[PDB]
Amino acid sequence: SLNTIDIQGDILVGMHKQKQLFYFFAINDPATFKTHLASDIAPVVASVTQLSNVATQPLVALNIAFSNTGLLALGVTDNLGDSLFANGQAKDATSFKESTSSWVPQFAGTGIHGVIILASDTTDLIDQQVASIESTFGSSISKLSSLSASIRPGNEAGHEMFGFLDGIAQPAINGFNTPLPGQNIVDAGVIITGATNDPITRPSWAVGGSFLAFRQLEQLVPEFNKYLLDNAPAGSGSLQARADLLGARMVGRWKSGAPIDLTPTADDPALGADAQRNNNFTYSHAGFDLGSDQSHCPFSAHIRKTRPRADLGGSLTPPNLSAGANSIMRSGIPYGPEVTSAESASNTTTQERGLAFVAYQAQLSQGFHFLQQTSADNANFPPGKTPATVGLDPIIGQNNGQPRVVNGLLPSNSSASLSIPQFVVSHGGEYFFSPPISAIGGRLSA
Ligand code: HEM
Asked: Which residues, renumbered to this chain, are glycosylated?
């Protein structure tokens, strides 16, 4: 059964701190690094168990993950059973129709050996912990780059940079989570390596870990806002209200979190806020043909692309349980400054902001990589639709820098196509393995 005492907390619970830092490092002098990995890091790595109880939530929550080259730097030559991980994300970039030539140079290679995730309610507390780490490891650890992140302020807390409530939908792990209405229920082995029904044999020390897919995804917020206003469908309501409808059609939820499948023409903030109701849908509606009806939610909507529910078969009434093996746990958090007055006024981005995207899964080919390549970037996914050309995911869909053709967004005519510029720009990332806690002071320090 699932030993959550040994699983790093960000995988199944999330850090849920106001501030987060992703500290990307290289390893020098591995013998020294190992001594301090065991003495300074292992004892303060936060587990799922620790983070699940308010009384044992640490002032500073810390998780750590290693790239393939990081594991090799530690002398670990075992096959973790994931080719995508082994090759690194840079080599996978072409799978998503982007080029590493546009990436942050540090990501465009395999020099990064790991990431330390620090999380606390102030940046000062994070900085203290970083200083402590640098002090004790000394030059055996080398900071290559970092990314600071934060829960957004005020009423936007929990929302991402475009303004949409985030973190609503996660797979429920059978035997661990108490499933919510509409929530998918999956074997632990979909997310945790070596757990129930993970078909891939793993090294013994790796049982209880997960692969971490990190993506630095810049969001062009003023451009997005202006696009919605310019293309707002006609109707009663303010221009902004109509623009909001278009945005909700693109995401699959209103900014409040209310799923459009359950409220297609108007927002419902109370619904959005209620975990017992805001996920209780399958995309099926009696009296409507699933293959052609986009009046409730477009086939191209972001959440419909990333969790198709009834589009891939299964129960038409909640909960739909299709494609469990293609589930990911998300622990993303926004980064960069809020949109400034001048940027909003000019409808133009000057400073970089976006999502520090984090997905956990036991198989990269089934999770993040599949959702990006086979769904989001695929004009003919989901399958079996009429028209067959769904178009691309308007939020994350990519086609080598070109505007994306996205169909079904306009309620007045499902055959109407929009050509949408990219609102999300990849600056690259890396694939890591978050080991079980026992491996940190154990195998990895040996
Ligand atoms: C800046 C980029 C992104 C933004 C702004 C964004 C935004 C959102 C929002 C607002 C939601 C709805 C809230 C929720 O259901 O929890 C969502 C859901 C989701 N997103 Fe994204 N996301 C981004 C990147 C990605 C990427 C790259 C992937 C995978 C390749 C992804 C996969 C998912 C999944 C699996 C869900 C939940 C779907 C469900 O269970 O119904 N997201 N995202």
From this structure: 280, 320, 347, 413
